Structures are given as structure tokens and as C-alpha cells.
Amino acid sequence: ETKFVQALFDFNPQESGELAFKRGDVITLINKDDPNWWEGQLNNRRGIFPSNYVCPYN
């Protein structure tokens, strides 16, 4: 099964390799082994983001 997470807030990246997103965007989960930094796919972009900035989606 493919997991999706909806962004609760905007995440403005401060380092390279971090997935930028806006509130309401839906990211496709790729990896979440790390309690704080998760990896996902938002459109043609892929990178890591703060786990606490999202929650599960449909």
C-alpha cells in the first residue's frame, strides 16, 4: 500500500535535499524510518521533510 500525507503547514527548506511544500499539499511517502525526517514525492520533486508538518491522508 502507498501512504499519503497531507501538509499541515508550509515548509520552507533551509538546506538542499529538503522537500518544499505548502499547506494542503499531499506527499507520497517513500521512507519514514527516521522519527523526524521523512522522505516523499511531491509532484516531480523528491526529498526529506519534518514528520510533524504532516498527517495521514486518504
Binding site: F11, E15, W37, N52, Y53
Partner: peptide, 7 residues
């Protein structure tokens, strides 16, 4: 937003 953990 909530606190971004240490990178």
C-alpha cells in the same frame, strides 16, 4: 508551525 527537529 511546530518546531522543526535538528537536521
Amino acid at each position: 508551525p511546530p518546531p522543526v527537529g535538528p537536521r
